[PDB]
């Protein structure tokens, strides 16, 4: 699998570039296969790039695009900490995507109640359904990365990042609030044609260098975030400073 690193000046430049790249990737996938399956992420740059996509959203036939999430905060549906809510405000509420093409992870006041394990297994069955229909399962899985290398809600040195069988798990004790999350696991992330890590800032530079260096994914979860066709690091100068 090829690896691409593309370094831009600063956060604003990075987010603009990443949004442009995503519009191009979605168009390319629709051209080749008649549809596109994309996995969204949260965090500042993950949501910021979606705002840029919104600027060019007329270039895409959204009836042909399917949306998943790599992780989600297991909190009430209307909570500001929700990744799906933030994505809807940034992009999804502004485009002609059919609601049934959008596959949000469950909320804690949703159909599974506050049962985290059931909610994770619910999304896993949905991915099994996607994975029964397409190979690889995803065209592009977007990711942010924390300073310690975490991606989705897979934190270093945890049973979640160690998971090799299940596609989705619950995390009940995230070291970063909120404590409860639903997350795709590395086997699910790795069933993407491309995995894109969008990373800004000095505090991320050590983890970028360790992940690109080919670290063990348990120690640096981002090192296991690898696409079947390519892995793309979209970074700014500050985050690239140890390459
Ligand atoms: Cl609000
Ligand atoms: Cl339980
Ligand atoms: Cu640039
Ligand atoms: Cu600037
Ligand atoms: Cu472009
Ligand atoms: Cu409420
Ligand atoms: Cu809140
Ligand atoms: Cu809040
Ligand atoms: Cu708002
Ligand atoms: Cu709008
Ligand atoms: Cu359901
Ligand atoms: Cu349970
Ligand atoms: Cu995270
Ligand atoms: Cu254990
Ligand atoms: Cu350092
Ligand atoms: Cu410079
Ligand atoms: Cu869908």
Author numbering: 2 to 244
The paper states:
Here we show that addition of cupric ions to a 6-phosphogluconolactonase 6-PGLac bearing a putative metal binding site leads to the emergence of peroxidase activity (kcat 7.8 × 10–2 s–1, KM 1.1 × 10–5 M).
Thus, 6-PGLac was co-crystallized with 3 mM CuSO4 followed by soaking with 12 mM CuSO4 (Cu·6-PGLac). The copper is bound to His67 and His104 (at a distance of 2.00 Å and 1.92 Å, respectively) and displays a weak contact with a water molecule (WATxx 2.80 Å), which is held in place via a hydrogen bond to the carbonyl oxygen of Val101 (O···O 2.81 Å). This structure also contains further unspecifically bound copper ions in the lactonase active site as well as on the surface. However, these binding sites are characterized by low occupancy, as reflected by the height of anomalous difference density peaks, and thus presumably have a far lower binding affinity for copper ions. The potentially coordinating oxygen of Asp131 identified by the in silico search and of the Tyr69 are located 6.55 Å and 4.25 Å from Cu1 respectively.
